[PDB]
Amino acid sequence: LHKEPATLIKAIDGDTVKLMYKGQPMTFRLLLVDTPEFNEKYGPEASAFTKKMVENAKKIEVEFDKGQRTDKYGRGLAYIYADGKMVNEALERQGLAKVAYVYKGNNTHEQLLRKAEAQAKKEKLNIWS
Ligand SMILES: Cc1cn([C@H]2C[C@H](OP(=O)(O)O)[C@@H](COP(=O)(O)O)O2)c(=O)[nH]c1=O
Ligand SMILES: [Ca+2]
8 A cells, every 4th residue: 555645624523534635625534443423422532633633744645445445425535644643543542433344455454453442442541441
């Protein structure tokens, strides 16, 4: 997989962000994770966490997997990096997402993310508290 440039347009919630990619605005949905909706427990904390990560980043990059690059809603599906750190993994390591929506052929980082979720669960963090 490879990283490609993008710039932030707007934070949305824990697992979606509006980015400019190849010069076009698109909403990205983070692969392999599910954050609570803003209206649910830990929703506001997830949204805040992702917002801080992406707003503070000097460099945002998008990494598509081997499969589908847009979902049925027209959202890009990617792993998102902020100054080299993967947002998807950071959410899992903090207990602010669950690994989910693991579809065959778009699951390159599944085991990296499950390892982070295991460590969050051992620490009883946030969702696992
Ligand atoms: C993460 C992801 C979601 N989706 C679709 C599945 C779910 O469809 P349904 O809307 O029919 O439940 C929806 C969940 O995204 P959200 O968690 O953002 O609601 O997005 C994909 O198709 N591929 C993906 O990789
Ligand atoms: Ca969600």
